[PDB]
Design a protein around this ligand. Sequence first.
Ligand SMILES: Nc1ncnc2c1ncn2[C@@H]1O[C@H](COP(=O)(O)OP(=O)(O)O)[C@@H](O)[C@H]1O
Ligand SMILES: Nc1ncnc2c1ncn2[C@@H]1O[C@H](COP(=O)(O)OP(=O)(O)O)[C@@H](O)[C@H]1O
Ligand SMILES: [Mg+2]
Ligand SMILES: [Mg+2]
Lengths: 323, 334
Amino acid sequence: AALNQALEMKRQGKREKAQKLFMHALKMDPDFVDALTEFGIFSEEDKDIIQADYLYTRALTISPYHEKALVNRDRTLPLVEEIDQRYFSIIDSKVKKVMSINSALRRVMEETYYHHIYHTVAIEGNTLTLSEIRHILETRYAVPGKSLEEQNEVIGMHAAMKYINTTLVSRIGSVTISDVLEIHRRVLGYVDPVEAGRFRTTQVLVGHHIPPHPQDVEKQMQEFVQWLNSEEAMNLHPVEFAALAHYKLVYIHPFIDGNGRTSRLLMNLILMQAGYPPITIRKEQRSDYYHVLEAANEGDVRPFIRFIAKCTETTLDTLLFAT
Amino acid sequence: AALNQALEMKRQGKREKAQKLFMHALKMDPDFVDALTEFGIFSEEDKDIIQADYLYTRALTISPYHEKALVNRDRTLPLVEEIDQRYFSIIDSKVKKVMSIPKGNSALRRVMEETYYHHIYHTVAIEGNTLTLSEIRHILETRYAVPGKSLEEQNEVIGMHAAMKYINTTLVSRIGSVTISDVLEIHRRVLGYVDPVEAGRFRTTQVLVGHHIPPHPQDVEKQMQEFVQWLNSEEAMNLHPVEFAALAHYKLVYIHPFIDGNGRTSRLLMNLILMQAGYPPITIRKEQRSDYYHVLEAANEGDVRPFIRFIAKCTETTLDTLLFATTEYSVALP
Ligand SMILES: Nc1ncnc2c1ncn2[C@@H]1O[C@H](COP(=O)(O)OP(=O)(O)O)[C@@H](O)[C@H]1O
Ligand SMILES: Nc1ncnc2c1ncn2[C@@H]1O[C@H](COP(=O)(O)OP(=O)(O)O)[C@@H](O)[C@H]1O
Ligand SMILES: [Mg+2]
Ligand SMILES: [Mg+2]
């Protein structure tokens, strides 16, 4: 198809030109095995083994026996497992330096705390500025010309964080379904006190994703918390555990609202319980954040795991910048 | 004691003077049987049989056999029961006038909206909420915050409206028993936007409320089961709607089941009882805070009649307003 033009293009370079044809052929058919497999060998020439591997894996989900994808995938499968293991051990070092450590650390933590709220709420259309958030929380006085729902999204954010940082981080034992609802009760309670702290009673669409039926939400959550307390989960790297817990909850979409915020908090609880600072997915990463969630729903949660790892690294880089 | 100075002073008039000595003797001892009886006799000379009766009723709670109180109390016990029965039948006529209006009527519809925001203004303002009626209309109509006012105050308003909506939609028209769950559902909305953890659940701690120590948090649940049993009893349905409402208001206030928002739920439950009997929702105005607490104090002390009467005067003033306002718009509106 358009693939052959990219292959001829690929020769003689104009690679930026070959990329567009590969990308266009992918838009016309994202399940085109020969385009995936050839675009992966293209991605490797640019030293992008992680993306090359993505495309060989997408290809073999569509065509399990495609020889060209197979011989490449066998090759990159564990090369990528190492590359990924390595990134995690790089994050661990930055965590050590941070946990090695004060005047300027304490100062950073606050600046950060209000910055987390600004980003967790802003990502989904909340128009409050960081100064307005600091105002709402410090003074307890409303902000002029801004909706009450927006300001109550902030109060609940702080109420929930307080509760986690005080009642759950230091606590020993199993993470319960009850804790998750307690987080949600605070997260959403000031905006919707009837729906906060209880599961979805209706079926919904979330982009192109239809989550479990409200009849199934409770079992899917019991299975989720079983997993959160499993050895399998505690044997993961905290970053991979956190990212998976974030995703798994988002996939269940147990509440009618405030799912993304509880997932980001649960993720930060998992991380903080493993001695990691709380991560912030910035407002500006919404497009990337949804692309990795889409690829995850499509079958590969690694880019989501990697997305959260780059968020983890950035958060630490920002902390160590105050050296 | 100082009673003898009033009594003598009372002779020769100088009543205003007499009153102060009676009031002072009452401040030094509110349980002085002879000062109560003499002051009741004094109150009748001014045509105040209801207050005279209060004083003889009070005296006989302290001294069951006091002859002077006793003979007066028989005279007045049932006079006052008639006077009270009569006021209620006067209120019924005014309700008939309100409920004799076509109800799609343009003038009333304006008054019903005005009264709604005015109720919220007063039910919240009575406990120090500084929001003005215009700020309340703003918060609810626009959904935008009000500058320079606390978020707690604006969330007290959102929860009142949320609760009133729920009552007016889900409970007024509903048939059957009023349950303990409905009361919590009201509270969930009333308080949820201010305290989402405590809203919809009973007190877990013991508290003081003025000079009143309510049931222990261990006892709150049984006291509420007894309360809703009473709300569904025929004894309660045989009362006049006004007396039933006022008693339900008081009984809940006495239990004080929640850590906050008790007064508001009681005023709402009171308005549910009334609305279920075909009465418009009444408003205890913020300017009546002092009187409202005095009648609750007298109730706690042993006599709930002044509280019942207080709510009846609120019922009458609400209707009077409604009728007058619906009549002013009948002319000046098209
Ligand atoms: N296609 C999708 N697949 C899976 N999860 C999704 C998808 N689209 C959105 N989400 C998730 O839904 C969240 C937004 O839903 P919502 O329940 O209203 O949470 P909140 O109120 O915290 O923003 C996003 O943050 C994301 O985590
Ligand atoms: N001494 C008292 N005796 C009986 N009830 C009282 C007393 N003091 C206060 N109350 C009741 O308590 C209410 C105020 O308490 P609260 O639980 O905080 O409710 P809210 O915040 O809605 O007003 C008053 O409206 C009144 O009904
Ligand atoms: Mg949302
Ligand atoms: Mg109060």
